[PDB]
Ligand SMILES: Cc1cc(C)nc(Nc2ccc(N)cc2)n1
């Protein structure tokens with residue numbers, strides 16, 4: 057009802073259409089990417105500095121670190137939105153790695169529509185310090201995008217890219233895409 061064909065537009069990048077959205081996966085360093093939103097996978101305190109979160113906070117810089125801990129004290133947040141700091145993005149959305157991944161991605165998509173943003177880049181949320189299983193994480197991320205498309209919600213969002221630190225985790229995402237393809 058929704059899925060196109062899996063192909064490779066550039067070495068190590070794989071893509072398919074999900075409705076009108078181009079969904080891509082690649083291995084590499086997410087802090088090198090340009091997108092309207094970059095997603096950080098962090099702790100319930102929004103102050104983790106391990107794995108992906110270490111790279112994101114170091115390169116985004118101290119003003120983003122401070123914005124996070126200011127919002128964390130204000131209220132109980134499922135996620136928080138900051139500026140992009142010295143990353144190549146307009147905003148960073150910091151999600152909790154241990155939370156339901158489908159719910160986290162659904163929230164990211166809705167926030168991007170609210171800002172009329174077109175591009176998103178995320179890590180394999182939950183596979184770092186939270187130790188969620190890669191197969192379950194891939195299924196959840198792609199399910200969130202399918203649900204968004206099915207509800208007719210895709211308007212401004214055109215591209216969703218997962219940049220994955222470990223090549224072995226990329227292989228799991230690729231297999232999940234092949235299972236779904238038209
Ligand atoms: C999962 C992941 C993703 C990325 C982009 N980096 C790391 N590790 C890391 C290594 C060295 C520094 N300085 C910072 C972070 N880990």
Ligand SMILES: [Cl-]
Pocket residue numbers: 097098153154181182183184185186187
């Ligand atoms: Cl994580």
Ligand SMILES: [Cl-]
Pocket residue numbers: 108179180181183219220221222
């Ligand atoms: Cl990752």
